[PDB]
């Protein structure tokens, strides 16, 4: 069902001298849910219950997000993809995930998860993905109506929009969810970002890192690498397509539809589809995991 309550209990662990927060419920092989910008483990709260008893259910809060520590001193050079990956790699190592992991990914969680899967392919049992960065983008691949805003994030205007005015949390987020969010739901999304200034830096560093028209080159190369790999990998896949969808449409979707050994369903949603169709998404993930784990 829908609902504003988080799933399970937040746990904390020290990583590179910082505390990171995560949900870790149940036993067995992990089903690892990764949020992106500007969300947290909270994104998965109505989806994870569908996988009850099917494995160890894990959702990590990226550094500087959710209940994870902020980086200090924060600034325009902090919270790059590379820095997030250092923290998340270390957290995932610390969690003792074993060698039959099912990844469930979204948004920046997909860049992180697809890249981790490429690097740890022997340990990946299945990959479920939705509204994901399936390959590097060209501007034509970025949803037309949001181009100007994201171009502004990727300019000097970004600090005012995001650090001062919290545009990613307050405008982009509800703008890409089809149903109205409750007061409690927005409170949960707002909480890590209540203070103006550097507390909000992760939500600006993220759009600045999106691999678009060759920039930034490091993230482009990472996405190029995992795009080639996923297009050939026999690892079972679940593609949760969205209508109307947002990012994973057009050529982005044409491309991921070429990936081997893949099941697809379509659910209602734009970008943050977990808030529109959580039960349809959860049901599909659970069915996928049941087939992977007979
Ligand atoms: Ca909306
Ligand atoms: Cl095992
Ligand atoms: Cl972003």
UniProtKB/TrEMBL annotation:
Ca(2+) binds at residues 174, 177. It catalyses: 1-haloalkane + H2O = a halide anion + a primary alcohol + H(+). GO terms for molecular function: haloalkane dehalogenase activity; metal ion binding. The keyword Ribosomal protein does not apply. It holds the Pfam family Abhydrolase_1. The active site is at 107 (nucleophile), 131 (proton donor), 271 (proton acceptor). Transmembrane segments: none annotated. Its EC number is 3.8.1.5. Residues 30-278 form the AB hydrolase-1 domain. Keywords: Calcium, Hydrolase, Metal-binding, Plasmid. Monomer. PANTHER family: EPOXIDE HYDROLASE. NCBIfam families: PRK03592.1 (NF002938). Catalyzes hydrolytic cleavage of carbon-halogen bonds in halogenated aliphatic compounds, leading to the formation of the corresponding primary alcohols, halide ions and protons. Belongs to the haloalkane dehalogenase family. Type 2 subfamily. This is Haloalkane dehalogenase.
């Amino acid at each position: 069902s829908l609902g504003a309550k988080p799933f399970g209990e937040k746990k904390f662990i020290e990583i590179k001298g910082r505390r990171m927060a995560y949900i870790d419920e149940g036993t067995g092989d992990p089903i690892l849910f990764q949020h992106g910008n500007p969300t947290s483990s909270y994104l998965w709260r109505n989806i994870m219950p569908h996988c009850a008893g099917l494995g160890r259910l894990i959702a990590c809060d990226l550094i500087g997000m959710g209940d994870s520590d902020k980086l200090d001193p924060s600034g325009p050079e902090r919270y790059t993809y590379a820095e997030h990956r250092d923290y998340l790699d270390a957290l995932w190592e610390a969690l003792d995930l074993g060698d039959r992991v099912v990844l469930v990914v979204h948004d920046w969680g997909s860049v992180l998860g697809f890249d981790w899967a490429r690097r740890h392919r022997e340990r990946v049992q299945g990959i479920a993905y939705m509204e994901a960065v399936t390959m590097p983008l060209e501007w034509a691949d970025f949803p037309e109506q949001d181009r100007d805003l994201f171009q502004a994030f990727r300019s000097q205007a970004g600090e005012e929009l995001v650090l001062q005015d919290n545009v990613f949390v307050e405008q982009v987020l509800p703008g890409l969810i089809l149903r109205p969010l409750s007061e409690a739901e927005m409170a949960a999304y707002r909480e890590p970002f209540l203070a103006a200034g550097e507390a909000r830096r992760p939500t600006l560093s993220w759009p600045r890192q999106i691999p678009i028209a060759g920039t930034p080159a490091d993230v482009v190369a990472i996405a190029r690498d995992y795009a080639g790999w996923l297009s050939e990998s026999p690892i079972p896949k679940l593609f949760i397509n969205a209508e109307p969808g947002h990012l994973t449409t057009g050529r982005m979707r044409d491309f991921c539809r070429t990936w081997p050994n893949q099941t697809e369903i379509t659910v209602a949603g734009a970008h943050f589809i977990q808030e529109d169709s959580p039960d349809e998404i959860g049901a599909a993930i659970a069915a996928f995991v049941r087939r992977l784990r007979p």
